[PDB]
């Protein structure tokens, strides 16, 4: 750590404090993430060093010193949560939403082709730059370190973007969980409000059910056999997506629906999503960022 000068605390991450820092020899500005160390975790993290893509925040190095672990990442100046709050009066323009979604799908397609999932996608870990790029931060860390109920500073880890199969107790969930999360994020960018802002696991589930309908064996074969499925769940009808994400045109609503399919095996893949007609006119606008 003596090789880095802390510039400023960025915040409190899932696993530990996060600092903006400068490398003393090369001059590089980086994000340093303390991870509050099993050999298995070191080996997993080590694998992430090679999982490089332009839409994945680059893992520069891993520093393990005195039973303390620090991850050194590419630094970006803003996150999507902050950008969305800043863009709340007018909304993020559809071409920019589309660009961001397209880029995020490319990052997912890459990592998913290597069988690596994120598992905790959320606006706070989607980072943006002045050039119109967006990148996924913290990819693969959930498998390395787990996703806790509370962070190291006791903050509640959000449930808002969690896939139903996770909430229903599926042990061996897949890359589809990331597609679900991204679909939730897509909807939030469009509407300027979280899609499913649950404040407990059951509230999360029931919010999903109230919008998408309570899942059953017709739409999700096997669902009634999942560990946390209860036959006593209320039965709500599915809403039309025209009511759920209004501004959004039929191509976007079609794609969102496929990203929000209940059955993970039927949920669209990132690679198939990239081919969807919604991206026919995709472009790369530059965001208004005041840093
Ligand atoms: C929620 C907050 C505490 C956090 O995890 C901040 O994370 C990060 N912030 C910046 N600017 N660049 C990064 N590169 C990788 N992760 C990054």
UniProtKB/Swiss-Prot annotation:
The modification N6-acetyllysine is found at residue 6. Induction: Induced transiently by TGFB1 at an early phase of TGFB1-mediated apoptosis. GO terms for biological process: cell division; cellular response to nitric oxide; cellular senescence; centriole replication; centrosome duplication; chromatin remodeling; DNA repair; DNA replication. Keywords: Acetylation, ATP-binding, Cell cycle, Cell division, Cytoplasm, Cytoskeleton, DNA damage, DNA repair, Endosome, Kinase, Magnesium, Meiosis, Metal-binding, Mitosis, Nucleotide-binding, Nucleus, Phosphoprotein, S-nitrosylation, Serine/threonine-protein kinase, Transferase. GO terms for cellular component: Cajal body; centrosome; chromosome, telomeric region; condensed chromosome; cyclin A1-CDK2 complex; cyclin A2-CDK2 complex; cyclin E1-CDK2 complex; cyclin E2-CDK2 complex. Residues 4-279 form the Protein kinase domain. Its main location: cytoplasm. Mg(2+) binds at residues 125, 138. The keyword Magnesium applies. It catalyses: L-seryl-[protein] + ATP = O-phospho-L-seryl-[protein] + ADP + H(+); L-threonyl-[protein] + ATP = O-phospho-L-threonyl-[protein] + ADP + H(+). Pfam families: Pkinase (PF00069). It is found in: Cytoplasm, Cytoskeleton, Microtubule organizing center, Centrosome; Nucleus, Cajal body; Cytoplasm; Endosome. Phosphorylation at Thr-14 or Tyr-15 inactivates the enzyme, while phosphorylation at Thr-153 activates it. The keyword Cell wall biogenesis/degradation does not apply. The active site is at 120 (proton acceptor). InterPro entries: CDK, Kinase-like_dom_sf, Prot_kinase_dom, Protein_kinase_ATP_BS, Ser/Thr_kinase_AS. Changing residue 153 to A: Abolishes activity. The modification N-acetylmethionine is found at residue 1. Binds 2 Mg(2+) ions. Phosphorylated at Thr-153 by CDK7 in a CAK complex. Phosphorylation at Thr-153 promotes kinase activity, whereas phosphorylation at Tyr-15 by WEE1 reduces slightly kinase activity. Phosphorylated on Thr-14 and Tyr-15 during S and G2 phases before being dephosphorylated by CDC25A. Nitrosylated after treatment with nitric oxide (DETA-NO). Found in a complex with CABLES1, CCNA1 and CCNE1. Interacts with CABLES1. Interacts with UHRF2. Part of a complex consisting of UHRF2, CDK2 and CCNE1. Interacts with the Speedy/Ringo proteins SPDYA and SPDYC. Interaction with SPDYA promotes kinase activation via a conformation change that alleviates obstruction of the substrate-binding cleft by the T-loop. Found in a complex with both SPDYA and CDKN1B/KIP1. Binds to RB1 and CDK7. Serine/threonine-protein kinase involved in the control of the cell cycle; essential for meiosis, but dispensable for mitosis. Phosphorylates CABLES1, CTNNB1, CDK2AP2, ERCC6, NBN, USP37, p53/TP53, NPM1, CDK7, RB1, BRCA2, MYC, NPAT, EZH2. Triggers duplication of centrosomes and DNA. Belongs to the protein kinase superfamily. CMGC Ser/Thr protein kinase family. CDC2/CDKX subfamily. PANTHER family: CELL DIVISION PROTEIN KINASE, CYCLIN-DEPENDENT KINASE 2. This is Cyclin-dependent kinase 2. It comes from Homo sapiens. The lineage of its organism: Eukaryota, Metazoa, Chordata, Craniata, Vertebrata.
């Amino acid at each position: 750590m003596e090789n880095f000068q802390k510039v400023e605390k960025i915040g409190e991450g899932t696993y530990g404090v996060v600092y903006k820092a400068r490398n003393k020899l090369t001059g590089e500005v980086v994000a340093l993430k303390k991870i509050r160390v099993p050999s298995t975790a070191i080996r997993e993290i080590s694998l992430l060093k090679e999982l490089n893509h332009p839409n994945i925040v680059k893992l520069l190095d891993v520093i393990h010193t005195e039973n303390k672990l620090y991850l050194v990442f590419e630094f970006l100046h803003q996150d999507l949560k902050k950008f969305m709050d800043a863009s709340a009066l007018t909304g993020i323009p559809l071409p920019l939403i589309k660009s961001y979604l397209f880029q995020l799908l490319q990052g997912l397609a890459f990592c998913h082709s290597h069988r690596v999932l994120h598992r905790d996608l959320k606006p706070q870990n989607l980072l943006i730059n002045t050039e119109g790029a967006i990148k996924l931060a913290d990819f693969g860390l959930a498998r390395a370190f787990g996703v806790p109920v509370r962070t190291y500073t006791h903050e509640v880890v959000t449930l808002w973007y969690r896939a139903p199969e996770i909430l229903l107790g599926c042990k061996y969930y897949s890359t589809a969980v990331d597609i679900w999360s991204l679909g939730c994020i897509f909807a939030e960018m469009v509407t300027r409000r979280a899609l499913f802002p649950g404040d407990s696991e059951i509230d999360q589930l029931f919010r999903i059910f109230r919008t998408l309908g309570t899942p059953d064996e017709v739409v999700w074969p096997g669902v009634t056999s999942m560990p946390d499925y209860k036959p006593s769940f209320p039965k709500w009808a599915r809403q039309d997506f025209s009511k759920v994400v209004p501004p959004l045109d039929e191509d976007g609503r079609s794609l969102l629906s496929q990203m929000l399919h209940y059955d993970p095996n039927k949920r669209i893949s990132a690679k198939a999503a990239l081919a969807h007609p919604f991206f026919q006119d995709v472009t790369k606008p530059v965001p208004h960022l005041r840093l």
